[PDB]
Amino acid sequence: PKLLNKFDKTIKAELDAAEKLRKRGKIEEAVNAFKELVRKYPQSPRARYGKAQCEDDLAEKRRSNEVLRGAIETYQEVASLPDVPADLLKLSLKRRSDRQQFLGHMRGSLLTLQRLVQLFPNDTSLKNDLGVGYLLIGDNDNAKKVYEEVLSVTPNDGFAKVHYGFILKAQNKIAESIPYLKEGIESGDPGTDDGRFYFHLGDAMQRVGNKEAYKWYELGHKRGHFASVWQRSLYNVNGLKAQPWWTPKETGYTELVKSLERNWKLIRDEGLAVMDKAKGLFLPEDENLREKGDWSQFTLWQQGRRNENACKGAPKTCTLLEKFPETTGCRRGQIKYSIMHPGTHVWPHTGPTNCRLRMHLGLVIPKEGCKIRCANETKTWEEGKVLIFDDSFEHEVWQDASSFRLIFIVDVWHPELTPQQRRSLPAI
Ligand SMILES: O=C(O)C(=O)C[C@@H](O)C(=O)O
Ligand SMILES: [Mn+2]
């Protein structure tokens, strides 16, 4: 790569030093060197480019945005000087865009990418990156137009294909998204071996009733994107017993389970009263997971935080749960009532973390028609009885009964997490 043009080429003899004072790892040296060559040879592009790469690394070191924000401008400075090597120009603005994205300046990074495409209107790689810039600001229509131009010129570019598929899927063109994601992934091209595209390919296939989704999930597993073909959560802790269904005894949380089973009519009655008196406290569940039907939830604890207005409506239930911080303190979980009406189907999905187990207490369960699957096992609820599964494993639900189904959902920390783990895990 030709980063040295005439104007600089003369004074390369000293350039090598500064860059190796970096490679050496003596960043302090490298910075001051390049800064000194900045004043000795203002005009030099490589001189600038060096000061910026120094600042970039000195920021990773100190972990200082303020620092990195300095580099982002110096990368811009490389691109103001004259007869700047196009290799070096591409390099510097590519890095600025990346660093802009790192800090959250998505539109700023888009502007940089827009500039690079104007400078280099035949670099496909840069158009691909521009489309990401558009995605990162939510402008999928302009991202769609970019990947269409690329595909018009390079019809087998896997990076554009998988991104085109994503955009199609997000425009509710689900069946059309699938071959784009399949072919992009199978191209093996750089940037296509990303767990997000396996996730979307399998979701799309499931949603059009294509059993081949699990092949791709298994391939995702083999490629490191998923714990297994069934357990596909994103935010995981290693070393936690992984099984879809659990018994109370297996969890150790036997006193919690007893308190829920033994006081279940109280728990029921408070929820039914909120249904009757404050029905708008039950909020509609995830529209994305809802194929059809009527499905709503009344949350008492969100990520370790008590909802106080909720507990004024379910006072005795909240008071009961206070005794069990394995759930009230589960920052990766929830505690919520959940009502599902006839004609409801919940798409197969997993939750976000393997750090919780999900308990379901049955409160109002019609005698036929309600069922939940987790992995290969399909079960049903019972009034006053708790079911426990690991919702990081794919689960799916159906409500084909003649009246409403009410359950009570209680997340607990995975029982193998140690107290210090429970204490230090970020919430989600
Ligand atoms: O508990 C979950 O994680 C579910 O996906 C289903 C649940 O919300 C329900 O009402 O049946
Ligand atoms: Mn779920």
Contact 189, 158 (CB under 8 A): yes
43 three-state secondary structure: coil
C-alpha–C-alpha distance, residues 200 and 339, integer Å? 28
Q: What's CA 151's distance to the chain center, in Å?
A: 27
Report which bound ligand comes closest to the CA of 397: 1
CATH 2.60.120.330 range(s) for the chain read 245-424
Give the C-alpha separation, 371 to 421, whole Å: 34
Q: Give the pair of three-digit tokens for residue 240.
A: 């936690």
Residue 338 marked ligand-binding: yes
- Contact 374 CB / ligand 1 (< 6 Å): no
Residue of the nearest CA to atom 7 in ligand 1? 338
Q: From CA 73, how far away is CA 67, in angstroms rounded?
A: 11
Q: What is the resolution of this structure in A?
A: 1.9
Query: Which class is domain 6-221?
Result: mainly alpha
Structure tokens at 66: 């303020």
Residue 287 CB coordination number (10 Å): 7
**Is 340 a known ligand-binding residue?**
no
Closest residue by Cα to atom 11, ligand 1, is 397
Task: Give the number of whichever ligand sits closest to the CA of residue 404.
Answer: 1
Q: Is 371 exposed, middle or buried (0-12, 13-18, 19+ CB in 10 A)?
A: middle
Q: What is the residue whose two structure tokens read 């919940």?
A: 346
249 alpha carbon – ligand 2 mean position (Å)? 23
What dotted CATH number matches 245-424?
2.60.120.330
Where is 379: in which H helix or E strand?
strand 377-379
> Whose CA is closest to 26, among 63, 52, 58, 50?
58
Ligand nearest to the CA of 336: 1
Residue ranges of the chain that CATH labels 1.25.40.10: 6-221
358 known ligand binder? yes
Q: Which residues of 102-141 are buried (b: 16+ CB within 10 A; e: fewer)?
A: eeebbebbbebbebbbeebeebbbbbbbbbbbbbbeebbe
Phi, psi of 54, rounded to the nearest 5 degrees = -55, -55
Contact between residue 405 and residue 294 where contact means Cβ atoms under 8 Å apart: no
